[PDB]
Amino acid sequence: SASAVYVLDLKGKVLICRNYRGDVDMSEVEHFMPILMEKEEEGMLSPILAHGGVRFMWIKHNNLYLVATSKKNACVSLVFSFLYKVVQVFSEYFKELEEESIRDNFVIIYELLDELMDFGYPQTTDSKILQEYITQEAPRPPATVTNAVSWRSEGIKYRKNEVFLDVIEAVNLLVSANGNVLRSEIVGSIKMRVFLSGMPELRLGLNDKVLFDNTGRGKSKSVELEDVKFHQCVRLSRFENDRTISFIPPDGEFELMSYRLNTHVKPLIWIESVIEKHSHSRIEYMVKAKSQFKRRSTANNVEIHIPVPNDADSPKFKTTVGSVKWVPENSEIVWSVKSFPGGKEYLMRAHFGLPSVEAEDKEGKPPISVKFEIPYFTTSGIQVRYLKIIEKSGYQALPWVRYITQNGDYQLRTQ
Amino acid sequence: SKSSVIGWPAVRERMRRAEPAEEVGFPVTPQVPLRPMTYKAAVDLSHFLKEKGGLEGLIHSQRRQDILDLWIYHTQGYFPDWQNYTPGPGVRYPLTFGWCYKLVPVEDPEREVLEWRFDSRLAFHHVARELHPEYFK
């Protein structure tokens, strides 16, 4: 229940503001910057600010803080969801999130803000629906918003019905400094870019453990996702009733389902780090990486970031496979590898000097994270059964999907 | 299917070698379609197995069934889930409609000896579906 949502800037200048209820004066935004500065200087800065009896919730954007001032005890979750929807709409409409587009599309920005929500209650949130009624370069509102199916616009015609799926896998491993993995969770991502004619209703079917158990086929490799979140077009009633994933696919790229379950398997890459740091004399980087993934799978664009000393200089790298580059801005050496086949063993030997004068304050031990991304690999073993594409007119669809495995929160605790 | 005919003798030899009673990861072939075996495809596979032999009368085993399913998936891309047997005790009808292969006793259900037997009526009569309507949805 934010009184007014405004877009700020890095210098504190409000790029654009639009009051929704009028219960909060527009002058409260000026005091938001000093409050944020005081909180940052004292560590008390929070996204949800509080200017007396009015709370100015702000979200750190790419170039400006999306401050949404509120007066009463409005739904914080609802305000956050509205801000996220507005950010997504802006990203869809404007490819750049900076001050360049804030002052360049104000004429359409004001109309979009007015149409998005009224009296603090959001009304329009579909990017396609908003673009079909508000454009930067007006007819009556589309019937899709008024109709029940607000995620699949009717009347779409395409020469061919091709849908591109993406089996995105996020391998997050939390290995402590003792060598034991604490947080090992893999979050699935079923994103499909449906581009066909009409408004077909997708009939999702995969090798789900729950579905296999219900159908009596709970003996093969079935993916048991601890948390599965359906898309907006996905009907929750069918999923709750018999796990039937029946919903109208969106027009374009959309996230239908997102699996999320813990992983009890060994990490795809086993990295052993050695720190032979002398007392203000030299430093040793005994980094050894072992590929625990299948040999048939190669990790493309693997970048194992090893945090080097903050004041370290004149470093020498003695590695075997993969180029190592030290970035002064990042204050660490990333073990960049173009192609890393499964089972590969890369050994590195860092050697650099240190300044004679010791540091005045400690800098901490940031965890070592890798940027491995091996596609065409299904670590979870979940196999899609079929995709029920049904249209009233009747057409033969040719859906496509690719399985991509990448490294997410694969951070290794430093010694 | 020349590839299927070639793989049938090796699969039969591997099944015979395995008694009736190391690499991690899940690599996927690029561009290879994956879908469950159809009723017509299951019937054709059962007929081919019956004609070539080595499937009817063989002792049913978990290792042999897994090897056969893996060979079928490698040769045609069909998921190794349609080669299921009906719940016991007794003769286990095919889980997927259209399958011409079923497991029947040859003498706890696990300790009972099962043997693969051809069944033409299985492809036309949903015995497994009738026995377990809940499993068939």
Binding site: - | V32, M37, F97
Partner: peptide
Amino acid sequence: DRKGGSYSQAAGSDSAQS
């Protein structure tokens, strides 16, 4: 081709489930 796994054809449903 494309990095991250080549696109593969998908079926319409589980043909073995009737």
